[PDB]
Design a protein around this nucleic acid. Structure first.
Lengths: 141, 120, 50, 46
RNA sequence: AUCCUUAUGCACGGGAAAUACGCAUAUCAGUGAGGAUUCGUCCGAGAUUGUGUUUUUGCUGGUUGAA
């Protein structure tokens, strides 16, 4: 998104793109990103075109990898009523798939100690992002 | 943090009784930042209350300033002085923490800012 | 190619001589390979302790 | 003066069984009042 | 037979605290209580509820007054 250019210095769709194109971006996240940009993002055209190209390539590869992972997860979910039925019963199939996928197999998951399971699928705990809930539940995930 | 509400009859609220252990830490931070800020001139001359002026003194100073501008009381040419006062309403009560945190990260070490945010 | 075996060997070595730093180093290296990519920091800490 | 609730009362009368009445859940303090009392009192046990 | 480690039981001695210490025909708890975290993970034993005392329990000594 950052690279894109064209109308990006004022506002493309700049703050529009984040919410839509990078689907994950929540308002809080976006605000902090904006703040960072205002302070530390140098916004001088990329060190070299070569560098830019490389970054693009990386993005393409990374994205592909992510997609593959997602597909795998989906497959696991589809299967898991056969794979890890008890777990599914306890929780729900999608959740089970997510857990199991993260682990590796079912065996891997089993090997994982219970206290850790909690914080699987947690969004990387940022210092700046607020945490305390009315719940008192530190993990989420 | 517990909030015993106050008893200023005309309008109540609020008193936040923070944990005694944390309080020390908070206190130190308050002392340090304020010291540091004063050293480094974070806050402009215009912000009050200063350490120098007792509020009546401050008022007096303000009055003097108002008097002691160039040709302020002249209204021959159709001049108009205007002394806008206002309460910045709900200022403390709608400080967004993310934004606040970011702002702090300009003026303090980020860890400190983070801590502050957490405490709030 | 065999990494599980290596790990086992390392463990055995540790059991026999715990304080030996080379064994610890080897273990660390193995960990870095990225089968676990976890229990990594803890392992490091343990190594340091020993 | 007690006009808004009369209908409700009537409805209640119509509906309830004896068994139901017998098995009312003898109620627990949702706002954990006694605990609070114990705590504050302990703190300010003079 | 001598020396040492561990736990416990009895005790000499010394120290701190009792806002602490219990008790329960309770409810739940290493088949996870409660917590940490740099977020990768880590520690791992009580928690809940009820309730009894809690500026104190048991015993002594003195002066005094009372008269």
């Amino acid at each position: 998104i950052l690279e894109n250019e064209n109308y990006s210095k004022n506002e493309s769709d700049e703050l529009f793109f984040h919410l839509e194109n990078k689907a994950k971006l929540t308002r809080e996240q976006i605000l902090v990103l904006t703040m960072s940009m205002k302070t530390s993002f140098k916004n001088k055209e990329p060190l070299d075109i070569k560098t830019r190209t490389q970054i693009l390539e990386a993005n393409s590869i990374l994205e592909n990898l992510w997609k593959l992972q997602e597909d795998i997860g989906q497959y696991i979910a589809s299967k898991i009523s056969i794979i890890a039925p008890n777990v599914c019963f306890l929780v729900g199939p999608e959740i089970a798939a997510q857990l199991i996928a993260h682990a590796g197999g079912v065996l891997e998951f089993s090997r994982i100690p219970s206290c850790n399971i909690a914080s699987i699928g947690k969004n990387k705990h940022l210092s700046h992002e607020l945490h305390t809930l009315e719940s008192g539940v530190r993990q989420e995930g | 943090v517990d909030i015993t509400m106050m008893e200023n009859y005309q309008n109540i609220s609020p008193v936040y009784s923070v944990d005694p252990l944390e309080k020390i830490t908070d206190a130190y931070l308050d002392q340090y930042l304020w010291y540091e800020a004063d050293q480094r001139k974070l806050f402009p001359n215009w912000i009050k209350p200063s350490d120098s002026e007792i509020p009546p003194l401050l008022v007096y100073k303000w009055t003097q300033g108002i008097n002691n501008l160039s040709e302020i009381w002249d209204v021959s040419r159709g001049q108009s002085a205007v002394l806008l006062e206002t309460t910045l309403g709900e200022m403390a009560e709608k400080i967004d923490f993310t934004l606040l945190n970011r702002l702090l990260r300009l003026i303090v070490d980020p860890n400190i800012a983070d801590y502050i945010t957490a405490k709030n | 190619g065999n990494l599980d075996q290596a790990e086992l060997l390392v463990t055995q070595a540790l059991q026999k001589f715990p304080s030996n730093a080379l064994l610890w180093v080897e273990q660390i290296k193995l960990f870095k390979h990225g089968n676990k990519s976890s229990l990594k920091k803890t392992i490091f800490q343990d190594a340091l302790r020993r | 003066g007690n006009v808004d609730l009369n209908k409700l009362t009537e409805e209640r009368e119509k509906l309830l069984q004896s068994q139901i009445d017998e098995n009312l859940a003898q109620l627990t303090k949702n706002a954990s009042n006694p605990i609070q009392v114990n705590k504050p009192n302990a703190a300010t046990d003079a």
